[PDB]
């Protein structure tokens, strides 16, 4: 929804390559998306903190090979979660403008003689119907996690006592999730979140050179293209699944 008001501000553009600034232009829109992203990245003491973070301790609480194995996999995924979380915030909001003049040309500077009435349209925010849901979700994305933590998580909560969610004692990990896990692993995602973000803040608007150097290297060129194009999975889907169906149909109905 925060992105949706962004798209309405510009002429329905969706590319980051022509997004920037908009801090003064969309103050409310920036504020909510930061609130949402912080809960998305599991910033401590947020709605998403209790829900997203507990997983890793629950994953690590099950002291098995698989549980520890996916803890690394989840954490490295959480690391990249931070990266695009700031990428949306940086490129759209915390960066130099990259669109045309009309997105930012305010009325403070005259810049016009006979077209003062029109042609400004400097990417204003939406009306009440567009902003009210933003504010309503903003409160939930801050507090709703803490209020219901005992409701769902708790420690011995009896909310699910009509056999709605059945759990078998043979693989209980709730007590181990809070006690046996070392303190470092409990706060480890917090360490990575605050750390790996500032490198992105350092790599853009502070240096803005290492990322370009890494792009143009032959090893770095393909890793950008490979991940951009979705691991080529749809390529392997269209050519060898659906085009195959479309040719078996062709063989049957002609031969």
């Amino acid at each position: 929804l925060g992105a949706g008001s962004v798209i309405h501000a510009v002429a329905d553009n969706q590319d980051f390559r022509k997004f920037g600034g908009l801090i003064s232009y969309l103050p409310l829109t920036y504020s909510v998306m930061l609130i949402a992203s912080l809960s998305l990245v599991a910033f401590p003491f947020m709605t998403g903190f209790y829900s997203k973070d507990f997983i890793l301790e629950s994953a690590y609480g099950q002291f098995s090979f698989s549980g520890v194995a996916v803890y690394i996999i989840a954490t490295i995924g959480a690391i990249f979660t931070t990266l695009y979380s700031v990428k949306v915030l940086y490129l759209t909001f915390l960066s130099n403008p990259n669109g045309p003049r009309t997105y930012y040309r305010l009325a403070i500077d005259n810049f016009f003689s006979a077209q003062a009435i029109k042609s400004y349209k400097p990417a204003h925010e939406g009306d009440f119907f567009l902003t009210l849901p933003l504010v309503i979700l903003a409160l939930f994305s801050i507090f709703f996690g803490f209020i219901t933590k005992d409701i769902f998580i708790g420690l011995g909560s009896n909310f699910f006592v009509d056999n709605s969610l059945f759990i078998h004692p043979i693989h209980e990990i709730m007590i181990d999730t809070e006690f046996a896990v070392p303190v470092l692993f409990k706060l480890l995602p917090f360490i990575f979140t605050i750390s790996f973000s500032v490198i992105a803040l350092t790599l853009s608007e502070l240096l803005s050179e290492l990322v370009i150097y890494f792009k143009f290297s032959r090893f770095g060129y393909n890793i950008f293209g490979f991940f951009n194009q979705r691991f080529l999975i749809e390529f392997f889907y269209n050519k060898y699944i659906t085009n195959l169906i479309l040719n078996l149909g062709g063989q049957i109905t002609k031969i």
Binding site: A11, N13, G99, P100, R101, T102, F112, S113, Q115
Partner: protein, 85 residues
């Protein structure tokens, strides 16, 4: 409501006014040919087009990027396409 004659003429004027490679900002008019009137060459013309479409938020196809060689044609070409923001 849409783009007007005065909307495009002055707005495009502030673009090439920043050139340090034109003869002078006072040599641009409604019918300023990119080569004869103000000082530009065969390679600068496409560089202007790169600017025009970027600040008009449209595309200029290679077929129609060659008839465009004067500011007068720019006014009529853009008003032809209502895709302009």
């Amino acid at each position: 409501e849409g783009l007007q004659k005065v909307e495009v003429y002055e707005r495009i004027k502030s673009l090439l006014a920043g050139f340090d490679k034109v003869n002078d900002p006072n040599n641009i008019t409604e019918t300023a040919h990119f080569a004869n009137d103000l000082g530009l060459d065969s390679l600068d013309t496409v560089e202007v087009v790169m600017a025009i479409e970027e600040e008009f938020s449209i595309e200029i196809p290679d077929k129609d990027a060659d008839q465009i060689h004067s500011v007068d044609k720019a006014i009529e070409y853009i008003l032809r396409q209502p895709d302009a923001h």
